[PDB]
C-alpha cells in the first residue's frame, strides 16, 4: 500500500542434465450451415427497442440493449428480449396470473421512459420515448 | 458442438476483462481490478452454422501478474490483441504481444482491437494504427463502454473458424420459461 | 487438495503429479482449472524450480509440462544466468541443444510438437544472448554444420536463425542495453556470410516445401538489416520473383520478402541496381498474371469467396504493389517499354480497391492519395494515368462512407435511425476519401461532374436507386465543394438540388424521407459559397430546415439544427443585413418565430438553435443593435427565468420539485449555448441574470443543507439533492463559459469575481465531502487561468478554501472522488503557473502538504492525475530556480531537492509507471542540472553529513549511489558508479540521457550487467570520428 505523508521506502537502508540422455548436446546428431429455430411458434404482438437493467441486491446493473417482444402462443403469453448484434436471450418470462409490473423509476430523470418488474432467476427494469413505454405497459398489463 | 479456445492479450488497463464482462453479463465494469494470470470464461452464441463456443482465456497484461505468460497460448485456435487508443504505450506494445502469441500459435486468426474509442481526447490516431496490415490481422476500433463494434471481433473470428464468410449471428433459441427501496437508487449509465 | 504437492520442494518432484496438474489446467475447467493455474504459477516462480527442469524435460510425458519447464529456464537465463557456475551454464546449453535435436530427429514429434520445438529454440536463443559469441564462438558453424544430418534439423535451424535475427535486430531496443544490442548485431553481421551460404543453398537445391518456407521466413527477417549486396549481387532476386512466386506454397512469404526487398537501402546512382528493381517487379507481376490471376479478375468477388489464404494473399499483393510503387513508380514512368508494366500494376490496384474490406481499402487509399497528390503537383505526368484516375473516380465515389455530419443511418431491421454513436473510424475514412476525391477532381473537373450528374440521373430513373447509392453519391457531391469555379458550381448545385427534391416527391414514407432529407442537408451545408450568392435560395434552405425540425424523425431534427449552425457559421452576414425585397434582417424574423420553429425540438436541440442565433447576432457590429438582438433572443428564457426566480424566492420548496429543476437547468443551458457562440458579447445577458443567479446558487446551497441535516450523508444520493446540485453545476458552467471567453477583464475582476467567490468558496469548504461539486474546482481553474494575475489575493483565498479540504478527500487511496482528484491537480497546476506567489504565502506546514500532494500525484496509475503531478513538479522546480539565490529558494532545496530526486527515481524504476517515462526523465534532468550547472547556492547536506567543503556534485552522486545501492543490492558498485557517471554527463541531451535510463532499467532486472554499457554514447561518438577520419583519407587517396 501507499501512504500519503510517507517518504517512499525506495532506497531506505537500515549438475544440470548430467545423468541424462540429451545431455549429450550436438553429439546426439466442423461447422456446417444449419437452421436454428427461434423456438417461437407464437406471434409477436408488440416490439420495441429497449434497454434492460437488473438488480439482485447494491445495485442496478446494465444487462442488454435490444428488441423486447411480447409473444402470443397461438393458444399463454411470454416476454422475449434479445441483445442487439450478438442476439443472445437476455429476457424470457411467461406471463402468469398475479404478475406485478409497475410504471416509473424515480431515481432517474428519464424515469417516465421506465418500467419495472419481478422475475425468476430478482428484478428487472426496462427503458424505452414515453409513448412507447406506456404501450409496452398496457400491452403487458392486458395479459393474465 | 465444437469449442474454440480464444486468447485475449494486451497491456493492463486496456479493457480486456471489461470487454469479456460486457459480453458475459451485459454490465459495464467501471473499476480496474487487474487480472492475475488468466481467467477462463465459456462464451457462446448462435449462427446459421449453429452454436459457436469460445473458451475465452482472459490474460493479465501487467508484467508482475503475468503468471504462465505465453504458456497460456498453447492450443489457442484464435486470439484478440487489445490496446487503448487513449494510451500510446499500449499500442507501442502491440508487436510484443503479437510476437509472443505467434511464436506459440503459428497460423491462427487474430483480431487487433483498439478500445475506448468513446473517449474524446484520443491519443493513438487512426493513421498510426498500421501494425495489423503486414501481419494479416483484422483491426477494429471498439468501445466496451458504448458497445461500438463490440460484436465484430467475434463475428470475424467465427467466420474464419467456420471457413465461411456466409456466417452471421442468428437468434439464440428462446425455450419455455421455468421494490420501493430500489426506485431511488442511481443508475450506472 | 493434492495438486499443491508439486510446491513441496523438500521431497523429490513427482513428475506424474506435475503432468496431472498441468492437464487439469489445460484440459480441465471451472474451479479445478483455476486452482491448478494458481499452483502452476507458484511452481514456475519458485526460484529453485529450474533445478527440476532437466528431469521434467527428459522424462515428462506431457508436452505442456515441458513448455512450463522451458519458461522456468527462460526466467533463469534472462535474469540470473551469470550467477551460475560454468558447470551449470555448459550443462544447460548442451541439454537444450540435445533435446532440440532429438525432437527434430523424431518425425512424429517434429510433425506434432511444433509449439514445443519452437519454445526450445527460443530458449536456445535466450542462451545465445548470454553466451554467444564470446563463450560459444563455434556455435554458428556447428549449427550450420548440423543442417546436413537431416531435412528436419536443417528446417529447424532456419527457425533458430530466424529467432536469433528477431531478438537481435527487431526486439532488442529496450530489452537489452544499447551496447549489448550493438555487440550482438556486430556478431551476427560478422557471421552472416555463412548464414546466407546455407540459406541460399536450400533456396536453389531444396525439395521440401516446409523447409523452403522456413528458409524464406528467415530471409524475411534478414532483409530488415542485411547489406544490399546480398539481395542485388546474387541471383536471389530472380529466384524470388520467378520460381518462388510460381509454386503455390511459397507464394505468400515470397511476396512479403519482395515487399521488404522494395524497402532496402539502395544506391540511388547505380543504374544496374535501378534496372534490377525494375526486373524483379516485372518478374513478379508476370508470374501473378500467368499463375495466379489476370488483371481483369474480379478481386472483389474472389476476396468475398475467401477460399484458402486468398484474402491474405490479396492483402499482401496490395501491400507489395503499394510499397514498391510509392518508392519506385518513377523508375517505370518514362521508358515506353515500361508503360504497360506501370499501368498493369495500377490496374491490379484498381481491382484490389473494389474489395469489400475496410482495412485493405485504407491500405490502397493511402497509396492513391500519394499518387494523385503527386499528379496535382506535377501535372505533366497527368496523362500517363488518365485512365487509372478516371476508374478511381468511380471507385471512390461508389465507396464514400458517412460524414460525421450525417446523423441518419440504417439499423438492423431495415429502418432508418438516428445514429447511436459517433464513429471515429468512419469519420477519418470519409476525410481521407474526400482529399483523394478533391485531388481527382482537380485532375479533371469536367469528368467528375459528368460522372456525378450521370449517377444521379440513374438515381431519378430508378435504375440504380437505393439508400446506399443515393447516400454515397450525395456524400461524394458534398465532399468536392471548392473544386469548381463559382460559375460551374452554380450550375452543378442547381441540378443536384432539383434532382434531390425530385427524389423527395417520388420516394415517400418515413424511411425514404429521412434518407433524402439527410442528403439534401448534407449538400446544402457544404456549399456555403453558393448559398451566399443566392439569398432567396439561402432563405429557402433555412425555411426547409425549419420544416425538417418538425419531422418526427429525430435524426432529421438533430441534423437540421446542426446544418443550421453549419450554414450560419459561414453565412451569418446574410442574416444581419436587410436583403433587397425584405422588410427586416432575417435574424429578427428568426427570433420572432422561435417558439413555433422549435416547438417540436428537444431541449438539447432547442439549445443548438439558440446557439446558431447567437452566431448570427455576434455578426452585428453596432453594440446597441447587438445588445438589443440578444435581449430579444433571450426573451423566452428570460421570461421563464424571471417567473421562476420570483416564485422560488417566495417559496424555496419549489426547488425540490424535479419539474422546477428541469426548467432551471434548461434556462441555464440555453444561456450556456448562446454564450458559447457569443463569448465576449454575451456579457449584457450575463449581467442581466447575474445577481438573481448567484442568489439562486446560495438558496439551492441551503436547500441542500436542509436535506443534509434532516437525513444525514445518504441525503446526497436522493433525486432531490441531485436535482439541487445540478442547478449549481449548471450555474458554474455558465460562469466558466463566459470567463473563459471574456475580453473585458476589468469587468470580470471588478464586477463578477467577488460575488462569485463569495457565493461559492465557503459553501464548498464547509459542505460534507460528498456534497462538494468538482465543478467548483473546474470553475476556479478558469478564474485563475483568465484573470489570476489581476487578483493575487483572490487566488490566495481560492487556494485556502479548497486545498486542504479537497486534499483530505483524495489522500487515502487512489480511487475515491476521481472527478475531484482530476480537477484538484488541474487547479494546482494553473495556480503554480499563473500565480506562484500563492504557494510562497502558505505557512510552511501547508507548503509541505503541497509537495506531498505532488509526490502522491506521481504514484497514481491514473495517467490524467499522473501527468499533471510530474508537470507540477517541473514547474515548481522551474519556479524555484527563477527566484535565484534567496532564502525561500535555498530552504526549498535543502528541504525538498532530494525528495523530488528519489521520488522520480522510484516511479522511473519500479515497473508500475512506464507511461510517465519521458516526463520523469525531463524532471530528473532538470534536478541534475540544478547541481551540475551550479544553480543551487547552498549546500544540499547538513554539516554532519560530509567532509567540510564537499561539493554538491560529489554529494549528489554519493547520495544517489547509496540510494541505488539500497534499492537494487544485486548491482555492483561499478555499475552504479558508471550509470551516474553517464547521467551526470548526459543531462543536457534528452535522447542520450533517456537511452541511459533505458539501459539502467534493463540492468536492474538481471544479475551481472556490464558497467561499461553506460559508455555507449561516448564510444559511439569516438567510433564516428574514426569513421570520418577514414572517410577523409579515402578521399585524399582517391585524388592524390
Ligand atoms: N472509457 C472507457 N473505459 C473503459 C472501456 N473499457 C474498459 N474501460 C476501463 O478500463 C479500466 C481497465 O479495465 P480492465 O478490463 O479491468 O483492464 P484489463 O485489460 O483487464 O487489464 P489487466 O487485467 O490488468 O490486464 C476499467 O476502469 C474500465 O472500466 C471503454 O470502452 N471505454
Ligand atoms: Mg483483466
CSV table of N, CA and C in Angstrom, one decimal, chain C residues 508-578:
chain,number,residue,atom,x,y,z
C,508,UNK,N,-41.6,8.2,-51.1
C,508,UNK,CA,-42.3,8.5,-49.9
C,508,UNK,C,-42.2,7.5,-48.7
C,509,UNK,N,-42.8,7.9,-47.6
C,509,UNK,CA,-42.7,7.1,-46.3
C,509,UNK,C,-41.5,7.6,-45.5
C,510,UNK,N,-41.6,7.4,-44.2
C,510,UNK,CA,-40.7,7.9,-43.2
C,510,UNK,C,-39.2,7.6,-43.5
C,511,UNK,N,-38.9,6.4,-43.9
C,511,UNK,CA,-37.5,5.9,-44.2
C,511,UNK,C,-36.9,6.6,-45.4
C,512,UNK,N,-37.6,6.6,-46.5
C,512,UNK,CA,-37.1,7.3,-47.7
C,512,UNK,C,-37.0,8.8,-47.5
C,513,UNK,N,-38.0,9.4,-46.8
C,513,UNK,CA,-37.9,10.9,-46.5
C,513,UNK,C,-36.7,11.3,-45.7
C,514,UNK,N,-36.4,10.5,-44.6
C,514,UNK,CA,-35.3,10.8,-43.8
C,514,UNK,C,-33.9,10.6,-44.5
C,515,UNK,N,-33.9,9.6,-45.3
C,515,UNK,CA,-32.7,9.4,-46.1
C,515,UNK,C,-32.4,10.6,-47.0
C,516,UNK,N,-33.5,11.0,-47.8
C,516,UNK,CA,-33.2,12.1,-48.8
C,516,UNK,C,-33.0,13.4,-48.1
C,517,UNK,N,-33.9,13.7,-47.1
C,517,UNK,CA,-33.7,14.9,-46.2
C,517,UNK,C,-32.2,15.0,-45.7
C,518,UNK,N,-31.6,13.9,-45.2
C,518,UNK,CA,-30.2,13.9,-44.8
C,518,UNK,C,-29.2,14.2,-45.9
C,519,UNK,N,-29.6,13.8,-47.1
C,519,UNK,CA,-28.7,14.0,-48.3
C,519,UNK,C,-28.7,15.5,-48.7
C,520,UNK,N,-29.9,16.1,-48.8
C,520,UNK,CA,-30.1,17.5,-49.1
C,520,UNK,C,-29.4,18.4,-48.1
C,521,UNK,N,-29.7,18.1,-46.8
C,521,UNK,CA,-29.0,18.8,-45.7
C,521,UNK,C,-27.5,18.8,-45.9
C,522,UNK,N,-26.9,17.6,-46.1
C,522,UNK,CA,-25.5,17.5,-46.2
C,522,UNK,C,-24.9,18.3,-47.3
C,523,UNK,N,-25.6,18.3,-48.5
C,523,UNK,CA,-25.2,19.0,-49.7
C,523,UNK,C,-25.3,20.6,-49.5
C,524,UNK,N,-26.4,21.0,-49.0
C,524,UNK,CA,-26.6,22.5,-48.8
C,524,UNK,C,-25.6,23.1,-47.9
C,525,UNK,N,-25.4,22.4,-46.7
C,525,UNK,CA,-24.4,22.8,-45.7
C,525,UNK,C,-22.9,22.8,-46.2
C,526,UNK,N,-22.6,22.1,-47.2
C,526,UNK,CA,-21.3,22.0,-47.8
C,526,UNK,C,-21.1,23.1,-48.9
C,527,UNK,N,-22.2,23.7,-49.3
C,527,UNK,CA,-22.0,24.7,-50.4
C,527,UNK,C,-22.2,26.2,-49.9
C,528,UNK,N,-21.5,26.6,-48.9
C,528,UNK,CA,-21.9,28.0,-48.5
C,528,UNK,C,-21.7,29.1,-49.5
C,529,UNK,N,-20.6,29.0,-50.3
C,529,UNK,CA,-20.3,30.0,-51.3
C,529,UNK,C,-21.5,30.3,-52.2
C,530,UNK,N,-22.2,29.2,-52.6
C,530,UNK,CA,-23.3,29.3,-53.4
C,530,UNK,C,-24.5,29.9,-52.7
C,531,UNK,N,-24.7,29.5,-51.4
C,531,UNK,CA,-25.8,30.0,-50.7
C,531,UNK,C,-25.6,31.5,-50.5
C,532,UNK,N,-24.3,31.9,-50.3
C,532,UNK,CA,-24.1,33.4,-50.1
C,532,UNK,C,-24.4,34.3,-51.3
C,533,UNK,N,-24.4,33.7,-52.5
C,533,UNK,CA,-24.7,34.5,-53.7
C,533,UNK,C,-26.2,34.5,-54.1
C,534,UNK,N,-27.0,33.7,-53.4
C,534,UNK,CA,-28.4,33.5,-53.8
C,534,UNK,C,-29.2,33.5,-52.6
C,535,UNK,N,-29.6,34.7,-52.2
C,535,UNK,CA,-30.3,35.0,-51.0
C,535,UNK,C,-31.6,34.2,-50.9
C,536,UNK,N,-32.4,34.3,-52.0
C,536,UNK,CA,-33.7,33.6,-52.0
C,536,UNK,C,-33.6,32.1,-51.9
C,537,UNK,N,-32.5,31.5,-52.5
C,537,UNK,CA,-32.2,30.2,-52.2
C,537,UNK,C,-31.7,30.0,-50.7
C,538,UNK,N,-30.7,30.7,-50.2
C,538,UNK,CA,-30.3,30.6,-48.8
C,538,UNK,C,-31.6,30.6,-47.9
C,539,UNK,N,-32.3,31.7,-47.9
C,539,UNK,CA,-33.6,31.9,-47.3
C,539,UNK,C,-34.5,30.6,-47.4
C,540,UNK,N,-34.7,30.1,-48.6
C,540,UNK,CA,-35.5,28.9,-48.8
C,540,UNK,C,-34.9,27.6,-48.2
C,541,UNK,N,-33.6,27.5,-48.1
C,541,UNK,CA,-32.9,26.4,-47.4
C,541,UNK,C,-33.2,26.4,-45.9
C,542,UNK,N,-33.0,27.6,-45.3
C,542,UNK,CA,-33.3,27.8,-43.9
C,542,UNK,C,-34.7,27.4,-43.6
C,543,UNK,N,-35.7,27.9,-44.4
C,543,UNK,CA,-37.1,27.5,-44.2
C,543,UNK,C,-37.3,26.0,-44.4
C,544,UNK,N,-36.6,25.4,-45.3
C,544,UNK,CA,-36.7,23.9,-45.4
C,544,UNK,C,-36.1,23.3,-44.1
C,545,UNK,N,-35.0,23.8,-43.6
C,545,UNK,CA,-34.5,23.3,-42.3
C,545,UNK,C,-35.6,23.4,-41.2
C,546,UNK,N,-36.3,24.5,-41.1
C,546,UNK,CA,-37.3,24.7,-40.1
C,546,UNK,C,-38.4,23.7,-40.2
C,547,UNK,N,-38.8,23.4,-41.4
C,547,UNK,CA,-39.7,22.2,-41.7
C,547,UNK,C,-39.2,20.9,-41.2
C,548,UNK,N,-37.9,20.6,-41.5
C,548,UNK,CA,-37.3,19.4,-41.0
C,548,UNK,C,-37.2,19.3,-39.5
C,549,UNK,N,-37.2,20.4,-38.8
C,549,UNK,CA,-37.2,20.5,-37.3
C,549,UNK,C,-38.6,20.1,-36.8
C,550,UNK,N,-39.6,20.0,-37.6
C,550,UNK,CA,-40.9,19.4,-37.3
C,550,UNK,C,-41.1,17.9,-37.6
C,551,UNK,N,-40.2,17.4,-38.5
C,551,UNK,CA,-40.2,15.9,-38.7
C,551,UNK,C,-40.3,15.1,-37.5
C,552,UNK,N,-41.0,14.0,-37.5
C,552,UNK,CA,-41.0,13.1,-36.3
C,552,UNK,C,-39.7,12.3,-36.2
C,553,UNK,N,-39.0,12.1,-37.3
C,553,UNK,CA,-37.7,11.5,-37.2
C,553,UNK,C,-36.7,12.5,-36.5
C,554,UNK,N,-36.1,11.9,-35.5
C,554,UNK,CA,-35.3,12.6,-34.5
C,554,UNK,C,-33.9,12.9,-35.1
C,555,UNK,N,-33.5,12.0,-36.0
C,555,UNK,CA,-32.2,12.2,-36.7
C,555,UNK,C,-32.3,13.3,-37.7
C,556,UNK,N,-33.5,13.5,-38.3
C,556,UNK,CA,-33.7,14.5,-39.3
C,556,UNK,C,-33.7,15.9,-38.5
C,557,UNK,N,-34.4,16.0,-37.3
C,557,UNK,CA,-34.4,17.2,-36.5
C,557,UNK,C,-33.0,17.5,-36.0
C,558,UNK,N,-32.2,16.5,-35.6
C,558,UNK,CA,-30.9,16.8,-35.0
C,558,UNK,C,-30.0,17.4,-36.1
C,559,UNK,N,-30.0,16.7,-37.2
C,559,UNK,CA,-29.3,17.2,-38.4
C,559,UNK,C,-29.7,18.6,-38.9
C,560,UNK,N,-31.0,18.9,-38.8
C,560,UNK,CA,-31.5,20.2,-39.3
C,560,UNK,C,-30.9,21.3,-38.4
C,561,UNK,N,-31.0,21.1,-37.0
C,561,UNK,CA,-30.3,22.0,-36.1
C,561,UNK,C,-28.8,22.2,-36.4
C,562,UNK,N,-28.1,21.1,-36.7
C,562,UNK,CA,-26.6,21.2,-36.9
C,562,UNK,C,-26.3,21.7,-38.2
C,563,UNK,N,-27.2,21.6,-39.2
C,563,UNK,CA,-27.0,22.1,-40.6
C,563,UNK,C,-27.1,23.6,-40.5
C,564,UNK,N,-28.1,24.1,-39.7
C,564,UNK,CA,-28.4,25.5,-39.4
C,564,UNK,C,-27.1,26.2,-38.9
C,565,UNK,N,-26.6,25.7,-37.8
C,565,UNK,CA,-25.3,26.1,-37.3
C,565,UNK,C,-24.2,26.1,-38.4
C,566,UNK,N,-24.1,25.0,-39.2
C,566,UNK,CA,-23.0,24.9,-40.1
C,566,UNK,C,-23.2,26.0,-41.2
C,567,UNK,N,-24.4,26.3,-41.6
C,567,UNK,CA,-24.6,27.3,-42.6
C,567,UNK,C,-24.4,28.7,-42.0
C,568,UNK,N,-25.0,28.9,-40.8
C,568,UNK,CA,-24.8,30.3,-40.3
C,568,UNK,C,-23.4,30.7,-39.9
C,569,UNK,N,-22.6,29.7,-39.7
C,569,UNK,CA,-21.2,29.9,-39.2
C,569,UNK,C,-20.5,30.5,-40.4
C,570,UNK,N,-20.9,30.1,-41.6
C,570,UNK,CA,-20.4,30.8,-42.8
C,570,UNK,C,-21.2,31.9,-43.4
C,571,UNK,N,-22.5,31.9,-43.1
C,571,UNK,CA,-23.4,32.8,-44.0
C,571,UNK,C,-24.0,33.9,-43.1
C,572,UNK,N,-23.5,34.1,-41.9
C,572,UNK,CA,-24.2,35.0,-40.9
C,572,UNK,C,-24.4,36.4,-41.4
C,573,UNK,N,-23.4,36.9,-42.1
C,573,UNK,CA,-23.5,38.3,-42.8
C,573,UNK,C,-24.9,38.5,-43.4
C,574,UNK,N,-25.4,37.4,-44.0
C,574,UNK,CA,-26.6,37.4,-44.8
C,574,UNK,C,-27.8,37.4,-44.0
C,575,UNK,N,-27.7,37.2,-42.7
C,575,UNK,CA,-28.9,37.2,-41.8
C,575,UNK,C,-28.9,38.6,-41.0
C,576,UNK,N,-27.8,39.3,-41.0
C,576,UNK,CA,-27.9,40.5,-40.2
C,576,UNK,C,-28.2,41.8,-41.0
C,577,UNK,N,-27.9,41.8,-42.3
C,577,UNK,CA,-28.3,42.9,-43.2
C,577,UNK,C,-29.7,42.7,-43.6
C,578,UNK,N,-30.3,43.8,-44.1
C,578,UNK,CA,-31.6,43.7,-44.7
C,578,UNK,C,-31.4,43.4,-46.2
